[PDB]
């Protein structure tokens, strides 16, 4: 008997610019595998790491997400002014509540814009973009930011021979806003709870709270059962987000797939079918595994380089923890 | 050359059903007064909290999340095969990784649909109702579970004075579809991360890892900050909340504040000047606070009690950590 409004935004939206960040801290494979038994050959050839970064002890997410922000804005060639919200997408903020989102909000100078923290594994960023992108279309915000961060550093056990020089940290954030032209396409996203435990914390914090006289908490990884998933999955994951976005796989020019492993991202881009030449991201030589920055990280890189110029048409797939996996067919920023 | 397509899904959309769990183990007033300096009395006219549920030892916000689904589920008509997409909303899943949002998935049957955790505080559900909403405009998904989940038992501080009484557990969901008329006001929402201290773990869990066998962390909430918060500023946000929804204060049936605390409640009731004979969410009573699960916990109480109808005019306000907040008008589920 008395309606709700029906509203709309805008129809076309885009990766306006991205900004990245990096710690300063150099990690060689020396120093990492010195403290268990392997060798700098034995990383390199197994999962295409060759140094990685990690964060200094005052360093958090939260901190290194500002820092990525601001850089996206400045590439963007905005203020925080301009700005309606900000999605922290992220699997390593330490802190059960407040969360980041708000933090990194304040920090940027617009303390009070929407925000929230998403979780889900290393394809976070994906489902990140992908809300932002549904939002903007929907009427709630006209401009956003969403910024994929991490600090895995102290989550890895040194004596864990088998994924202790795969995680690192950094931080990488993009200005979503309107174009002329449409810029993301549609999500493509799914997961698989069976094998949520493939990529895990070992043991929650109330647990390991009520008895600190036993382990604490490590990152565990089978690394079997996730080069499999993902090597075998994340190609027909790739397919749909192209089937979504009308667009053919010769067509695509920058392929930027979470930075888990080199072997698992070389054996996807002949499934995938691309062409010869398209740019393949190898961000993860010298960035390593950073969960939900990896691609925003990596499409920065690319960019950074030369390599990928802005409006290159972009398959992003990410895959990881929870088992989760959310692509899209992007145009490229800044 | 080469567009970018778009989707598009129900313009549309509404809360289908509300599927609610509260576990069996009741905690009284005295019960909570055993390590703390108060009574009854003092308890239930500062906060209006009479009792509240705790969950059991081999319970979590998964366990929870999931049987709330269900009910949900059960309620809409529908199967997990009607799902495309599950959003958990919490604050207590006491693993970095990997989400709760897999998991829940997995125990319901529908193993490979999409989903992620959604981290905002108290205000978390009225964020990923948002979302919801918003991703099934979008096209992305057609129908859709949002579970709001807590476990907050082990994260109290029993002889915590200032908040030992006022969190509890519990899960509610609903199911967001598409519906004949529109269901579901845009999303209004913000935050104040100055004051991201007020409700807070007070260390992170690295920073205890690192040194275990000291103080743990605990809930902790600076009561009249966040009193004085909500009480002068959730008005014009509710105000905010009816204004996108073409809604005047008159119009609302029934009003859900998130459940903080009575005495901030009734002067919400006030200050948006709703009808004398509005119908007001209290489940606070047998319930205490908690969290993300409180507005559709709320909802559920209403419509249980048949104090509000499926269908009425709603208007839901939440509010909590990171200072966040999270309103939208919408229409009555179950
Ligand atoms: C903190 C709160 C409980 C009131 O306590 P308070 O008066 O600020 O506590 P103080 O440490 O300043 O102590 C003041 C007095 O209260 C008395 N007191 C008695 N029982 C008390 C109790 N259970 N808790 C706190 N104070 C109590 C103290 O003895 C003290 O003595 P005095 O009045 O003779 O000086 C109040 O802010 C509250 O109701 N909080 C929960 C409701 C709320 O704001 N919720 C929002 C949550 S999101
Ligand atoms: S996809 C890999 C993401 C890694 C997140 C794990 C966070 C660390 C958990 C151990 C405390
Ligand atoms: S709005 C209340 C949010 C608080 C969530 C409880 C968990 C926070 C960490 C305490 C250890």
């Excluded at 034995?42 to 820092?67: H, L, N, P, Q, V």
């Excluded at 990896?294 to 797939?317: F, H, N, Q, V, Y």
Aim: charge should be negative; glycine fraction near 10%; include cysteine.
């Amino acid at each position: 008997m008395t309606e709700i409004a029906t509203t709309s935004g805008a129809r076309s939206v885009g990766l306006l610019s991205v900004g990245a960040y990096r710690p300063e801290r150099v990690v060689t494979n020396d120093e990492i595998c010195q403290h268990i038994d392997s060798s700098d050959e034995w990383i390199y050839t197994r999962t295409g790491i060759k140094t990685r970064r990690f964060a200094a002890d005052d360093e958090s997410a939260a901190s290194m997400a500002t820092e990525a922000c601001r850089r996206a804005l400045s590439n963007a060639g905005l203020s925080a002014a301009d700005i309606d919200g900000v999605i922290v997408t992220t699997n390593t903020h330490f802190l059960q509540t407040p969360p980041a989102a708000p933090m990194v909000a304040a920090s940027l100078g617009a303390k009070g814009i929407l925000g929230f923290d998403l979780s889900a594994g290393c394809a976070g960023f994906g489902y990140a973009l992908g809300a932002a992108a549904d939002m903007i279309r929907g009427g709630g915000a006209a401009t956003m930011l969403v910024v994929g961060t991490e600090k895995l550093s102290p989550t890895i056990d040194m004596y864990d021979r088998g994924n202790c020089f795969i995680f690192a940290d950094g931080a990488a954030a993009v200005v979503v806003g309107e174009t002329p032209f449409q810029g993301i396409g549609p999500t493509v996203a799914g997961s698989d709870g069976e094998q949520a435990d493939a990529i895990r914390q070992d043991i929650d914090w109330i647990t390991f709270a009520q008895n600190p006289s036993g382990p604490r908490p490590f990152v565990r990884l089978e690394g079997p059962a996730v080069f499999r998933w993902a090597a075998f999955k994340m190609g027909d994951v790739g397919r749909r987000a192209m089937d979504a976005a009308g667009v053919r796989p010769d067509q695509i020019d920058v392929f930027v797939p979470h930075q888990a492993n080199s072997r698992i991202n070389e054996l996807l881009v002949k499934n995938l079918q691309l062409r010869p030449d398209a740019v393949v991201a190898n961000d993860i030589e010298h960035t390593g595994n950073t969960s939900a920055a990896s691609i925003p990280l990596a499409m920065a890189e690319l960019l950074t380089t030369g390599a990928a110029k802005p409006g290159d048409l972009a398959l992003l797939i990410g895959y990881g923890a929870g088992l989760s996996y959310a692509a899209q067919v992007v145009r490229m920023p800044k």
